[PDB]
């Protein structure tokens, strides 16, 4: 049963089947968030986000839905906005501390483990609650490109392609098709086009939507996280439409 009565009113409690229902409810909260996807290309990562069209009163350049943790790490999240902001702040702090200590940018697996330990620590006591966000992050290090997805339980994994939010099922189906049709791999620009296509397919929607695409590629951005400029974004949008 999805509702565990008598075992869902406090964090860090085991059900008779060995389940933790507060973490599952945080997962339910995550599943109602905006659709976000990540694709791992031959030598980089691409992140794509579907966003709702807001009022014209918002400053166009001060509203970015893709967060930069470090010069080589990109991140998006689905769920509670404040929880995502808190987790991104913690990730930036961890990256800064590692770079100060060991004079090198932090490898993606180490960053993922630190974030996962921090998230898991919030499923241990009844005085806190689990984070209501699922985070797709990635980047490039000396060992290559890495893409990870982290869940409210603290469990994280590396992915060839990841999706989260309301339209997670369609996005996952498209990602599986893309993996099947490209056993050899995929390039950064082709990844951008496919990410635009997947976001458009998943959205298909009340009035309109906008698309944000970011990428980090050794060949394209010299292993740095950058937002997609006007020309490439327009090309991706046109490819997605037709």
């Amino acid at each position: 049963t999805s509702i565990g009565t008598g075992y869902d009113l406090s964090n860090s409690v085991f059900s008779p089947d060995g389940r933790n229902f507060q973490v599952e409810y945080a997962v339910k909260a995550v599943e109602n968030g905006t659709t976000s996807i990540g694709i791992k290309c031959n030598d980089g990562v691409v992140f794509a986000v579907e966003k709702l069209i807001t009022s014209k009163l918002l400053v166009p350049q001060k509203n970015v839905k893709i967060q930069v943790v470090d010069r080589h790490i990109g991140c998006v999240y689905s769920g509670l906005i404040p929880d995502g902001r808190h987790l991104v702040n913690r990730g930036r702090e961890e990256a800064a501390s590692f770079k100060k200590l060991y004079k090198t940018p932090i490898p993606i697996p180490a960053f993922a483990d630190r974030l996962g330990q921090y998230v898991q620590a919030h499923t241990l006591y009844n005085s806190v609650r689990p984070f209501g966000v699922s985070t797709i992050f990635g980047g490039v290090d000396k060992n290559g490109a890495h893409l990870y997805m982290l869940e409210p339980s603290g469990s994280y994994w590396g992915y060839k392609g990841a999706a989260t939010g309301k339209g997670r099922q369609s996005a996952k189906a498209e990602l599986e098709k893309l993996v099947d049709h490209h056993p050899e791999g995929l390039s950064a620009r082709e990844a951008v086009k496919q990410a635009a296509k997947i976001i458009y397919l998943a959205h298909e929607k009340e009035k309109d939507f906008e698309l944000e695409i970011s990428w980090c590629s050794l060949s394209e951005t010299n292993g740095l996280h950058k937002f997609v400029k006007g020309d490439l974004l327009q090309e991706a949008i046109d490819f997605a439409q037709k």
């Binding site: 008598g6 075992y7 406090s10 860090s12 409690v13 085991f14 059900s15 008779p16 089947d17 060995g18 389940r19 697996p109 483990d113 996962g116 330990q117 998230v119 898991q120 499923t123 241990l124 006591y125 009844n126 893409l147 990870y148 339980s153 603290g154 469990s155 994994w157 590396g158 992915y159 060839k160 392609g161 990841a162 996952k172 990602l175 599986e176 993996v179 099947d180």
Partner: protein, 240 residues
């Protein structure tokens, strides 16, 4: 059902039981994964089943086998977040033992230390037990090949060989039959590759299914180091 304050905290039921501990035990089988551990003449071998049904996952990042110290390896049955928590705790414990007492921590002593921590969790109202089962393996400089296991109840004990998971009964029965036939408590082999092959064959016979190179993880502890085999090593071991 606990039917009381034991629905949340670890206190005695009228029958004299701790339901949260038993529920953590139930949680230990969430991943639906089996692991086996056997001892050679001068090596110890652990083999864990790997299930990656999702095509979008990166298999190289899926592992339940951890390197705790130079000579100690660990296999965990249960969810991966608690597994990583326990792995970091065990690493810190081993390093602190070396700093405080001047020699490397034995496998059994580390198992006892983790069991004492689990006892703390069982007795404290505001601390929950971790829903994992830990299996430490090594080649101790005094005891030779060593396997020890700890559970959420705080109980720990050593084994000639062990199996953990939903299908652990069949594997244990097969191990008991083989040991009764051989009338020894260890595997009579001189190379760890042969012990790895024997453990793979035992797992295949017990589970009744065939395994490829990507369906298993293998860790080997010798008197020098504990190391994890890669895909090529497991593929080489399968061909025999």
């Amino acid at each position: 059902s606990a039917a009381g304050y034991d629905r949340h905290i670890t206190i005695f039921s009228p029958e004299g039981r701790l339901y949260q501990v038993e529920y953590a035990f139930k949680a230990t089988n969430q991943t639906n994964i089996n692991s086996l551990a056997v001892r050679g003449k001068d090596c110890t071998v652990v083999i864990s089943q790997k299930k990656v049904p999702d095509k979008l996952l990166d298999p190289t990042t899926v592992s339940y086998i951890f390197c705790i110290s130079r000579t100690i390896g660990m296999v965990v049955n249960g969810p991966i977040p608690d597994a990583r928590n326990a792995a970091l705790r065990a690493k810190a414990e081993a390093a602190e033992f070396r700093y405080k007492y001047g020699y490397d921590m034995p496998c059994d002593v580390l198992a006892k230390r983790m069991a004492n921590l689990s006892q703390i969790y069982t007795q404290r109202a505001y601390m929950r037990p971790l829903g994992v089962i830990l299996t430490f393996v090594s080649v101790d400089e005094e005891l030779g090949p060593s396997i020890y296991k700890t559970d959420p109840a705080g109980y720990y004990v050593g084994y000639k060989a062990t199996a953990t998971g939903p299908k652990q009964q069949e594997i244990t029965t097969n191990l008991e039959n083989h040991f009764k036939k051989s009338k020894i408590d260890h595997i009579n082999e001189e190379s760890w590759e042969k012990v790895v092959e024997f453990a793979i064959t035992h797992m295949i016979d017990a589970l009744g299914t065939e395994f490829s190179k990507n369906d298993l993880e293998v860790g080997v502890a010798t008197k020098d180091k504990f190391f994890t085999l890669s895909a090529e090593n497991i593929e080489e071991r399968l061909v025999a």
